[PDB]
Design an enzyme around this catalytic site. Structure first.
Site, PDB file in Angstrom:
ATOM      1  N   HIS A 102       0.806  -1.248   0.000  1.00 39.13           N
ATOM      2  CA  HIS A 102       0.000   0.000   0.000  1.00 39.13           C
ATOM      3  C   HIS A 102       0.836   1.294   0.000  1.00 39.13           C
ATOM      4  CE1 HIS A 102       0.196   0.062   4.470  1.00 39.13           C
ATOM      5  NE2 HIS A 102       0.256   1.376   4.250  1.00 39.13           N
ATOM      6  N   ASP A 126      -0.614  -7.486   1.690  1.00 41.37           N
ATOM      7  CA  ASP A 126       0.034  -6.180   1.780  1.00 41.37           C
ATOM      8  C   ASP A 126       1.535  -6.367   1.930  1.00 41.37           C
ATOM      9  OD1 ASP A 126       0.328  -3.433   1.795  1.00 41.37           O
ATOM     10  OD2 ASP A 126      -0.527  -3.134   3.796  1.00 41.37           O
ATOM     11  N   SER A 128       3.923   2.336   8.444  1.00 42.46           N
ATOM     12  CA  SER A 128       3.612   1.217   7.554  1.00 42.46           C
ATOM     13  C   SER A 128       4.784   0.793   6.689  1.00 42.46           C
ATOM     14  CB  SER A 128       2.368   1.494   6.724  1.00 42.46           C
ATOM     15  OG  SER A 128       2.592   2.531   5.786  1.00 42.46           O
ATOM     16  N   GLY A 129       4.870  -0.520   6.472  1.00 41.89           N
ATOM     17  CA  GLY A 129       5.957  -1.074   5.678  1.00 41.89           C
ATOM     18  C   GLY A 129       7.121  -1.516   6.534  1.00 41.89           C
ATOM     19  N   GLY A 155       2.816   6.664   8.894  1.00 46.58           N
ATOM     20  CA  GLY A 155       4.244   6.771   8.575  1.00 46.58           C
ATOM     21  C   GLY A 155       5.048   5.564   9.007  1.00 46.58           C
TER      22      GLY A 155
HETATM   23  C1  9FD Z   1       7.338  14.917   6.207  1.00 46.57           C
HETATM   24  O1  9FD Z   1       6.975  13.604   5.703  1.00 46.57           O
HETATM   25  C2  9FD Z   1       5.760  13.139   6.058  1.00 46.57           C
HETATM   26  O2  9FD Z   1       4.991  13.729   6.789  1.00 46.57           O
HETATM   27  N1  9FD Z   1       5.546  11.926   5.476  1.00 46.57           N
HETATM   28  C3  9FD Z   1       4.497  11.002   5.759  1.00 46.57           C
HETATM   29  C4  9FD Z   1       3.586  11.127   6.808  1.00 46.57           C
HETATM   30  C5  9FD Z   1       2.556  10.212   6.954  1.00 46.57           C
HETATM   31  C6  9FD Z   1       2.396   9.160   6.049  1.00 46.57           C
HETATM   32  C7  9FD Z   1       3.313   9.037   4.983  1.00 46.57           C
HETATM   33  C8  9FD Z   1       4.353   9.950   4.858  1.00 46.57           C
HETATM   34  N2  9FD Z   1       3.092   8.070   3.972  1.00 46.57           N
HETATM   35  C9  9FD Z   1       2.122   8.160   3.034  1.00 46.57           C
HETATM   36  O3  9FD Z   1       1.253   9.031   3.036  1.00 46.57           O
HETATM   37  C10 9FD Z   1       2.181   7.108   1.948  1.00 46.57           C
HETATM   38  C11 9FD Z   1       0.871   6.324   1.806  1.00 46.57           C
HETATM   39  C12 9FD Z   1       0.802   5.692   0.418  1.00 46.57           C
HETATM   40  C13 9FD Z   1       0.651   5.291   2.934  1.00 46.57           C
HETATM   41  C14 9FD Z   1      -0.773   5.334   3.542  1.00 46.57           C
HETATM   42  C15 9FD Z   1      -1.019   4.620   4.894  1.00 46.57           C
HETATM   43  C16 9FD Z   1       0.021   4.851   6.000  1.00 46.57           C
HETATM   44  N3  9FD Z   1      -0.365   4.204   7.245  1.00 46.57           N
HETATM   45  C17 9FD Z   1       0.564   3.971   8.193  1.00 46.57           C
HETATM   46  O4  9FD Z   1       1.713   4.389   8.072  1.00 46.57           O
HETATM   47  C18 9FD Z   1       0.134   3.146   9.348  1.00 46.57           C
HETATM   48  C19 9FD Z   1      -1.069   2.635   9.610  1.00 46.57           C
HETATM   49  C20 9FD Z   1      -1.449   1.870  10.809  1.00 46.57           C
HETATM   50  C21 9FD Z   1      -0.872   0.603  11.005  1.00 46.57           C
HETATM   51  C22 9FD Z   1      -1.117  -0.091  12.180  1.00 46.57           C
HETATM   52 CL1  9FD Z   1      -0.413  -1.686  12.397  1.00 46.57          CL
HETATM   53  C23 9FD Z   1      -1.911   0.441  13.181  1.00 46.57           C
HETATM   54  C24 9FD Z   1      -2.495   1.691  12.997  1.00 46.57           C
HETATM   55  C25 9FD Z   1      -2.303   2.387  11.799  1.00 46.57           C
HETATM   56  N4  9FD Z   1      -3.065   3.575  11.556  1.00 46.57           N
HETATM   57  C26 9FD Z   1      -4.384   3.790  11.471  1.00 46.57           C
HETATM   58  N5  9FD Z   1      -4.608   5.048  11.205  1.00 46.57           N
HETATM   59  N6  9FD Z   1      -3.381   5.629  11.121  1.00 46.57           N
HETATM   60  N7  9FD Z   1      -2.442   4.755  11.326  1.00 46.57           N
HETATM   61  C27 9FD Z   1       0.289   6.315   6.181  1.00 46.57           C
HETATM   62  N8  9FD Z   1       1.473   6.878   6.054  1.00 46.57           N
HETATM   63  C28 9FD Z   1       1.255   8.243   6.209  1.00 46.57           C
HETATM   64  C29 9FD Z   1      -0.075   8.463   6.432  1.00 46.57           C
HETATM   65  N9  9FD Z   1      -0.675   7.235   6.410  1.00 46.57           N
END
Ligand code: 9FD
Length: 238
Positions: free
Chosen positions: A44, A93, A188-189, A186
């Site tokens: 994802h 995933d 995830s992965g 942030g």
């Molecule tokens: C300054 O840099 C920043 O701020 N970068 C920056 C900042 C923020 C993000 C990113 C870059 N990445 C993305 O948006 C890529 C995009 C495809 C990825 C989508 C999904 C991703 N999810 C998680 O990472 C984790 C989820 C998660 C996992 C578990 Cl096990 C438990 C609860 C969780 N959550 C439920 N609700 N929130 N969390 C995410 N990542 C962000 C937002 N969301």
């Protein structure tokens, strides 16, 4: 990471920070070194990523502030997404990044062992989730890599917590009944690393959850042991 603490440098040497360069450079996702040209991460993370050319993998990082224009990184030759993947909530995933160059192993960057098929029956009691993700639902990427110890939850108990979802055995859950410690935006992965017989194993890949660290909402991870043959298929191709 919610409810975690600062990691010590070299504590999670398989942990990487995956950055995107488009439109501007920022942390995108976590990942784990599993081989000298391989990163294991979540499918994802590549939503809307049309090319591997915009990706930069940084290994041996404790603090995001170590990353500047002059910081070395690994380019990505190829993005391999599980071809049954549709969305995080439906499973599969998982993705591999084939790096353009080889990672030189050392005390700051080295691989984590994949779980063994014979260890599907082992009970892990020392599991940690790591990342530079948010400490709460609306926050920001953290400078220092965070860590949180979290207990694994049975599939039966996780299914009870996610009414309306299908929690398959290709997923593994982790969290406290009362909440408080979990992955968040942030993270995830990244890895869910479990220590067994003094060896760390890549048990899970941070995937999804309903909010972050909520009571009776465990984090849902890709169950890596169920994908060992798929990883070997892709990394050991003749
Ligand atoms: C300054 O840099 C920043 O701020 N970068 C920056 C900042 C923020 C993000 C990113 C870059 N990445 C993305 O948006 C890529 C995009 C495809 C990825 C989508 C999904 C991703 N999810 C998680 O990472 C984790 C989820 C998660 C996992 C578990 Cl096990 C438990 C609860 C969780 N959550 C439920 N609700 N929130 N969390 C995410 N990542 C962000 C937002 N969301």
């Amino acid at each position: 990471i919610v409810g975690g603490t600062a990691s010590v440098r070299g504590e999670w040497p398989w942990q990487v920070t995956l950055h995107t360069t488009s439109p501007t450079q920022r942390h995108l996702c976590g990942g784990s070194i599993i081989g000298n040209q391989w990163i294991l991460t979540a499918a994802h993370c590549f939503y809307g990523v049309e090319s591997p050319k915009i990706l930069r993998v940084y290994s041996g990082i404790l603090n995001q502030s170590e990353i500047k224009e002059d910081t070395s990184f690994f380019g990505v030759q190829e993005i391999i997404i599980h071809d049954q993947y549709k969305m995080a909530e439906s499973g599969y995933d998982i993705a591999l990044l084939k790096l353009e160059t080889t990672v030189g192993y050392g005390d700051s960057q080295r691989p984590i062992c994949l779980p063994s098929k014979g260890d599907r029956n082992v009970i892990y009691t020392d599991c940690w989730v790591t990342g530079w993700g948010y400490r709460k639902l609306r926050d920001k990427i953290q400078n220092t890599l965070q860590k949180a110890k979290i207990p694994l939850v049975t599939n039966e108990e996780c299914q009870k917590r996610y009414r309306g979802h299908k929690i398959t055995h290709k997923m593994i859950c982790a969290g406290y009944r009362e909440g408080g410690k979990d992955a968040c935006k942030g993270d995830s992965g990244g890895p869910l690393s479990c220590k067994h017989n003094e060896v760390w194993h890549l048990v899970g890949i941070t995937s999804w959850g309903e909010g972050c660290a909520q009571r009776e909402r465990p984090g849902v991870y890709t169950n890596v042991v169920e994908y060992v043959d798929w990883i070997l298929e892709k990394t050991q191709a003749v």
